[PDB]
Amino acid sequence: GGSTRNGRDSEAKRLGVKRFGGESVLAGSIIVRQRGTKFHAGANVGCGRDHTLFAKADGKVKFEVKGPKNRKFISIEAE
Amino acid sequence: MFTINAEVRKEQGKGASRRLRAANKFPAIIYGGKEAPLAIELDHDKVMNMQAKAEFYSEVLTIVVDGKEIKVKAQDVQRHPYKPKLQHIDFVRA
């Protein structure tokens, strides 16, 4: 027995691509809690303690798949 | 042997195939060998009785068209789910 009791506020999944925020490091460009299929491509600064990706300074956001295991990385084109 | 008369299709897709089947005909494809594949249409009433015989999938057919005589062999058949009809036929050159 027992129902309801469902968690709330599952946060967010995708926050943008290309020059959507652009300015500064941002705090989007990541599926929080994901890690897999969303890794730091070196161009953007690594994950946060909760697996959150963010930019360095500026640029477009791009997604690529490369390396063994065919994992997807997010990079930023500095401008 | 078995000889089947066919005509070259001029419009392909879901609607075209459904119209063909509404007109008591059905599409088919001839591929294999070295030539590029070509799509044709056959008449259901005549092809069904011929296919009923178990030799149709055994010996080499003869797809008579406007002077090509490709003599292909039956490769695959798609039939209607719940009634005795033919939806499609894949032929491989031999």
Binding site: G1, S3 | A54, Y57, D76, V77, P81, Y82
Partner: protein
Amino acid sequence: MLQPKRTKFRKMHKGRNRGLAQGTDVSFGSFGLKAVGRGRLTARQIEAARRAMTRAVKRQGKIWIRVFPDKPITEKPLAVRMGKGKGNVEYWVALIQPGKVLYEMDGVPEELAREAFKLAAAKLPIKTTFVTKTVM
């Protein structure tokens, strides 16, 4: 009556019944009985239809069952208000699409398999038709 030995979940959503059947060919036996309409098919119905043809042929040939009741069906009691949780499972059913083959037989003549499948269809709720193994 046929039903799974163990269930990962005891209750399941109603869901819809759309599309055509996937297994539409006579694969195991030589003759088959295949549905033409759509609808539910309960374990009791399957069991009664099985007995029909099994006793029609007594001891001859082999019989296959292609469908299987997988999803449970709930039902709340008679004098009960709406709500207060989901009902309780009462019987198991199999969703069948048009063209689904239900039963097959191999070691029997056509003239006897036809009558056995006629008797089984009399029990079945959905309308069916007799099909032959043929070739690819």
